Amino acid sequence: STGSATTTPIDSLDDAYITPVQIGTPAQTLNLDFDTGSSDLWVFSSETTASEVDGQTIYTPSKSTTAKLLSGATWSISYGDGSSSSGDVYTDTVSVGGLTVTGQAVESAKKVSSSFTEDSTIDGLLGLAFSTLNTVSPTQQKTFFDNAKASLDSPVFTADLGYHAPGTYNFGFIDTTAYTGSITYTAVSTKQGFWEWTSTGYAVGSGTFKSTSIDGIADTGTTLLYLPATVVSAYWAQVSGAKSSSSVGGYVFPCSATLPSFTFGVGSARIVIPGDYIDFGPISTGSSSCFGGIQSSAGIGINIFGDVALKAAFVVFNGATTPTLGFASK
């Protein structure tokens, strides 16, 4: 089997991407944030504290003939941005782009933090990291991908995120029309539960490539590119007037600037992030200070190849017995 679904930016900055997901019988379609940095499929629901719902579409398990309470199971998750959610668990039928999993754990939120409430466009998350990170207790549950894997034509999914445009998540096949050149594959460590890999270096604009190992994670659920302070300083030094602002929470730059590109290495291959991808617009409405899309990972504890980086590539998440990651230009 295979599946193919379009993923759409939630706003004009590509802050996140939503993908429609069918849950239950008859189908209830919710728009979920596919997150290769976590491993829980959770949704706003009929159980979510009413004051914490503001515009989201909810899953109502009592209206699904295939829903079953997973008795005694609870979940609770905290994300890198400080947001969180928790609740109980149902199993139900879940379909993405024509690919169906029966008996998928659907984690129903009883509580969500303010960031989730305030984002009316995101109805929940669909985790695509390794199932070892799943938070369901006392019986850990599998991701949608893990459950689907055996049925797929090939044990892979691909992320093809757009810049200010829709893109695609495919399951079970590699669309050879969706990228240019060849795909370069690189090793993955699953030791921390992430799609963790080592970039071979970077360049700023038309500058020379610096060969240096940068361990980090491919994380579709993180907006920006978070890299070591040395790398980030070298980038922003090429933008007149750019500075790190503790009050704003990162590097800012004059909105009048033209940003240089940023290149990262995948083995001997190179992925180029155009400068425009690194512009996250005014820090507040009407400001002439703009927020940067490359930020320091210092104090996160891990480097993160988030959407800024991933959207410059066609990315293969290869879930074979020994997982790997592939990157192609597009």
The residue ranges of every structural domain in the chain are 5-174, 175-330
Query: Beta-carbon neighbour count of residue 284 at 10 Å?
Result: 9
**Nearest by Cα to 126 from 247, 260, 30, 227:** 30
Tokens of 38: 């976590």
Whether 35 sits among the annotated catalytic residues: the reply is yes
Distance CA 323, CA 303 (A): 19
| Residue 160: active-site member | no
Cα(307)–Cα(317) distance, integer angstroms: 15
The structure tokens listed for 266 are: 């995948």
In the sheet that holds 303-305, the strands lie side by side as 269-273, 262-266, 196-204, 210-218, 303-305, 225-227, 294-296
DSSP code of residue 97? T
Find residue 124's DSSP bridge partners: 43
Residue 242: CB partners within 8 Å, gap ≥ 6?
236, 251, 252, 253, 254, 257, 292
Beta bridge pairs of residue 23: 28, 94
Tell me how far apart the alpha carbons of residues 40 and 140 are, in angstroms, rounded to a whole number: 10
* Separation of alpha carbons 271 and 182, rounded Å: 12
What letter represents residue 296's amino acid?
S
Which residues lie across from 292 on neighbouring strands? 279
Resolution of the structure, angstroms:
1.0
Domain 175-330 has CATH 3.60.15.10: no
Residue tagged active-site, from 38, 39, 131, 199: 199
Apex 40 CA angle, 86 and 148, nearest 5: 150
Any idea what the Cα angle at residue 105 is, between residues 4 and 224, rounded to 5°?
Answer: 55
Measure the CA–CA gap between 268 and 100, rounded to whole angstroms. 37
**Polymer length of the chain:** 330
Check 33, 35, 123, 279 and give the catalytic one. Answer: 35
Q: In terms of DSSP bridges, do strands 124-127 and 28-35 run parallel, antiparallel, or are they unpaired?
A: parallel
Cα 181 to Cα 129, 198, 205, 218: the distances in Å are 27, 21, 21, 21
Q: What is the CATH number of domain 5-174?
A: 2.40.70.10
d(CA 324, CA 311): 18
